[PDB]
Amino acid sequence: TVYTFPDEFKLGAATASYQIEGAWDENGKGPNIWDTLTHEHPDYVVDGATGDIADDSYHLYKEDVKILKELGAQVYRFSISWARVLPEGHDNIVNQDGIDYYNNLINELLANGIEPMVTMYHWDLPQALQDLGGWPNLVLAKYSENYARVLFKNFGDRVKLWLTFNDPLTFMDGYASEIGMAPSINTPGIGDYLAAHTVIHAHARIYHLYDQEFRAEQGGKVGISLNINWCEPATNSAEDRASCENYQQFNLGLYAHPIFTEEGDYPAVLKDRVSRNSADEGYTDSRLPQFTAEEVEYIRGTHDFLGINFYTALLGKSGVEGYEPSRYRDSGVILTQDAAWPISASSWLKVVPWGFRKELNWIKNEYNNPPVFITENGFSDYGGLNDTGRVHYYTEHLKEMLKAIHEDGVNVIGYTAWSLMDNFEWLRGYSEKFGIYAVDFEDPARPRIPKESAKVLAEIMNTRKIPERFRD
Numbered sequence: 001t002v003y004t005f006p007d008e009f010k011l012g013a014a015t016a017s018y019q020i021e022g023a024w025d026e027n028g029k030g031p032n033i034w035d036t037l038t039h040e041h042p043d044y045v046v047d048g049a050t051g052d053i054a055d056d057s058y059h060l061y062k063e064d065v066k067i068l069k070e071l072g073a074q075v076y077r078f079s080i081s082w083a084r085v086l087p088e089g090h091d092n093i094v095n096q097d098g099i100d101y102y103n104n105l106i107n108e109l110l111a112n113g114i115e116p117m118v119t120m121y122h123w124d125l126p127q128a129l130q131d132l133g134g135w136p137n138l139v140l141a142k143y144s145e146n147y148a149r150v151l152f153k154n155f156g157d158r159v160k161l162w163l164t165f166n167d168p169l170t171f172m173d174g175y176a177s178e179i180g181m182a183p184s185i186n187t188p189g190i191g192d193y194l195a196a197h198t199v200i201h202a203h204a205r206i207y208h209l210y211d212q213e214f215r216a217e218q219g220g221k222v223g224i225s226l227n228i229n230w231c232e233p234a235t236n237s238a239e240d241r242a243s244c245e246n247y248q249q250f251n252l253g254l255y256a257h258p259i260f261t262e263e264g265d266y267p268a269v270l271k272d273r274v275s276r277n278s279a280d281e282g283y284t285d286s287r288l289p290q291f292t293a294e295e296v297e298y299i300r301g302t303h304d305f306l307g308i309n310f311y312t313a314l315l316g317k318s319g320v321e322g323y324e325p326s327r328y329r330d331s332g333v334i335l336t337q338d339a340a341w342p343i344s345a346s347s348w349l350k351v352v353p354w355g356f357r358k359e360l361n362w363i364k365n366e367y368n369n370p371p372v373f374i375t376e377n378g379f380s381d382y383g384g385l386n387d388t389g390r391v392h393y394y395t396e397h398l399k400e401m402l403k404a405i406h407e408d409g410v411n412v413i414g415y416t417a418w419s420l421m422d423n424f425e426w427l428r429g430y431s432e433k434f435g436i437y438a439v440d441f442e443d444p445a446r447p448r449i450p451k452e453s454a455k456v457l458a459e460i461m462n463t464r465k466i467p468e469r470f471r472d
């Protein structure tokens with residue numbers, strides 16, 4: 001039983017628009033911040049790669065559905081490109097080609113018995129909105145509501161699972177370095193917090209919009225996807241345990257405390273540590289923005305489920321490091337990884353499957369056991385179809401999740417493997433492979449070929465159990 005999926009549990013796979021679509025300027029699509037980064041700053045990206053073509057899923061979406069059907073996916077999580085739909089960012093112009101494209105994908109999925117799950121924002125902000133300052137500018141919350149309205153209006157009759165944002169903890173970091181994630185702005189400890197504040201407001205506006213204008217007719221669910229790693233105490237001391245709690249609150253709690261708790265607002269430790277550090281450095285005002293009481297009440301409770309992106313673990317010890325100012329320095333934890341942990345093709349990604357069970361329990365206890373949908377979990381290598389490391393990664397993480405469900409009572413309701421195909425991997429270009437299907441980026445037809453992990457995942461999805469050969 002601990003190896004069997006609950007009957008209603010949803011299994012599938014996931015992708016993101018800029019990572020797969022290509023067709024970056026085709027049929028009316030406007031430019032986004034990743035078009036800008038890869039065109040203007042190829043020195044930031046491995047091999048100077050771009051997402052101009054990527055997997056060419058704009059043209060090859062029927063092939064993507066074919067492989068999802070082969071895999072036996074029940075749900076396909078994909079994201080919508082904001083600038084493909086609203087090329088100017090604002091809602092004055094709706095690109096019919098964009099509407100037709102996503103309807104064509106949704107309809108193809110449904111005709112093949114696969115449920116669509118749509119992420120509204122996976123990092124590809126229209127450049128016209130970045131030119132106003134992007135996420136640090138609170139005006140983007142209303143622009144995000146207007147974008148969501150166009151999505152609910154056009155697609156909500158058929159789409160019943162929505163995520164507003166994918167991993168703002170990472171995308172806010174685009175405002176904390178001059179050479180990093182788009183838009184590559186160096187405002188650490190200041191602009192990244194402003195970006196977080198806008199995203200939280202935007203998410204809350206989108207959820208209220210669904211309640212007011214769409215839920216009664218459409219009957220779907222709206223969540224948000226938050227990335228978090230497990231943080232294990234470097235030693236068993238109370239002080240190192242405190243540092244791990246700081247990590248959880250500064251990385252997951254930053255977004256989840258305002259939305260998923262009864263109290264709302266940012267975590268106290270976040271408010272308090274940033275206030276103290278700002279005062280010690282001579283600022284008149286805290287670097288952390290504030291919510292009014294009315295805003296706290298508006299934002300809290302804006303969820304039907306919690307999306308979790310989980311990849312790895314860290315060790316945390318008591319102390320402070322990082323540059324002043326920065327979110328890492330403010331967080332009051334020294335983070336490392338254990339050299340014993342198995343490695344991947346990504347410097348930051350170590351294989352620590354027991355950390356997934358620990359994290360699921362931390363979430364259960366902090367947020368009163370919300371329904372959790374694992375929206376990303378996966379592994380990198382440099383290439384190859386006989387992807388034993390990826391197979392092991394998936395089987396171990398699924399086993400740990402199933403223990404969380406069955407033994408620990410955690411309400412996990414679905415899981416989409418990251419990712420369906422090898423991707424444009426952001427600053428890593430085409431150098432790192434996260435797919436369960438390989439794609440030949442040198443072949444204009446971009447054929448998709450199953451790896452061993454795709455065959456194992458199909459076996460899991462078909463049998464609804466972890467096969468005996470992978471059990472302890």
Ligand SMILES: O=[N+]([O-])c1ccc(O[C@@H]2O[C@H](CO)[C@@H](O)[C@H](O)[C@H]2O)cc1
Pocket residue numbers: 016019166167170227229309311312348376419423425434
């Ligand atoms: O803190 N971490 O461990 C972490 C943060 C952000 C992450 O981001 C993920 O990274 C994947 C692999 O590159 C991308 O394909 C995917 O688009 C992205 O959501 C993944 C992991």
